[PDB]
Design a protein around this ligand. Structure first.
Ligand SMILES: *[C@@H]1O[C@H](CO)[C@@H](O)[C@H](O)[C@H]1NC(C)=O
Ligand SMILES: *[C@@H]1O[C@H](CO)[C@@H](O)[C@H](O)[C@H]1NC(C)=O
Ligand SMILES: *[C@@H]1O[C@H](CO)[C@@H](O)[C@H](O)[C@H]1NC(C)=O
Ligand SMILES: *[C@@H]1O[C@H](CO)[C@@H](O)[C@H](O)[C@H]1NC(C)=O
Ligand SMILES: *[C@@H]1O[C@H](CO)[C@@H](O)[C@H](O)[C@H]1NC(C)=O
Ligand SMILES: *[C@@H]1O[C@H](CO)[C@@H](O)[C@H](O)[C@H]1NC(C)=O
Length: 220
């Protein structure tokens, strides 16, 4: 289980435990997965791997695609990543780097737009030295991407991986669970939600997996 960010990552002026990162509460190193929607700029295994610090061969393997193909805009892909503990072993995160392309970008646009909510403004503020009001083109940010490793309880239940899923409008825990062939209660467990809680678009949600994720993700 990890606490759900619950749209606290919209409130960049305040610090919330969940927005600083998933807590290192299990094994210190594991294989994990992110998801990512291709865009005109990030439309190939090489460009996406560079942004997210994965490899083109891993993306090719996980999605059953060529390492050199383009992807139609808005294709959801899985991205295999290491997940390990960082910052005095406090957080599970996967580090990557991002150089600001245009002055005007902010910690929020980096976390929410460029990285599609795979990180948070608060984690970027906490883990970088730049004045949040004066970020400029060329600043090279460390971006702590959200991931986790299964807890002992989840492993005992048969979960091999956790995958960080990006919620879109019109999804429910049941529709997301159908993608991965898991019980939605296991998604609730993984995110410290109940069947009465809500999930929100443009937030990351951990999906516990018994097997590798499907090679093609279709929301509906
Ligand atoms: C956040 O975590 C710390 C230590 O883990 C502790 O203050 C408490 O459990 C949480 N509270 C707040 C206000 O963040
Ligand atoms: C995993 O960690 C190794 C060693 O730090 C690093 O070289 C590699 O880029 C990482 N790969 C992924 C997919 O996270
Ligand atoms: C990830 O980035 C943080 C913040 O700069 C750093 O403290 C940590 O050592 C990094 N972990 C790596 C590179 O494995
Ligand atoms: C990729 O992740 C590894 C740790 O797994 C880290 O050492 C390396 O600095 C990262 N690369 C980038 C470009 O941030
Ligand atoms: C967050 O990013 C999405 C694209 O991933 C964008 O559509 C949305 O406008 C951004 N959220 C805010 C509050 O600006
Ligand atoms: C930003 O830093 C990373 C390592 O933290 C490095 O791999 C990358 O080349 C740097 N970006 C630029 C544009 O120099």
């Amino acid at each position: 289980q990890q606490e759900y960010v619950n749209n606290k990552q919209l409130d960049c002026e305040n610090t919330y435990n969940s927005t600083l990162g998933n807590i290192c509460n299990s094994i210190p190193s594991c294989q994990s997965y992110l998801t990512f929607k291709s865009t005109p700029q990030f439309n190939t295994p090489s460009s996406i791997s560079h942004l997210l610090n994965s490899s083109a061969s891993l993306i090719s393997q996980s999605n059953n695609i060529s390492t050199v193909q383009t992807l139609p805009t808005d294709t959801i892909i899985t991205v295999p990543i290491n997940c390990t503990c960082s910052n005095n072993n406090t957080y599970y995160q996967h580090n990557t780097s991002y150089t600001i392309q245009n002055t005007g970008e902010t910690y929020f646009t980096v976390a929410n737009n460029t990285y599609q909510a795979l990180s948070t403004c608060q984690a970027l503020i906490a883990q970088n030295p730049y004045n949040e009001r004066k970020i400029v083109r060329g600043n090279n940010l460390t971006v702590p991407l959200r991931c986790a490793c299964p807890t002992k309880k989840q492993s005992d239940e048969g979960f091999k991986y956790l995958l960080t899923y990006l919620v879109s409008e019109g999804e429910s825990v049941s529709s997301i669970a159908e993608i991965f062939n898991v019980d939605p209660q296991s998604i609730n467990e993984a995110n410290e939600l109940s069947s009465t809680s809500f999930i929100f678009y443009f937030t990351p949600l951990l999906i516990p997996l018994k097997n590798e994720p499907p090679q093609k993700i279709v929301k509906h």
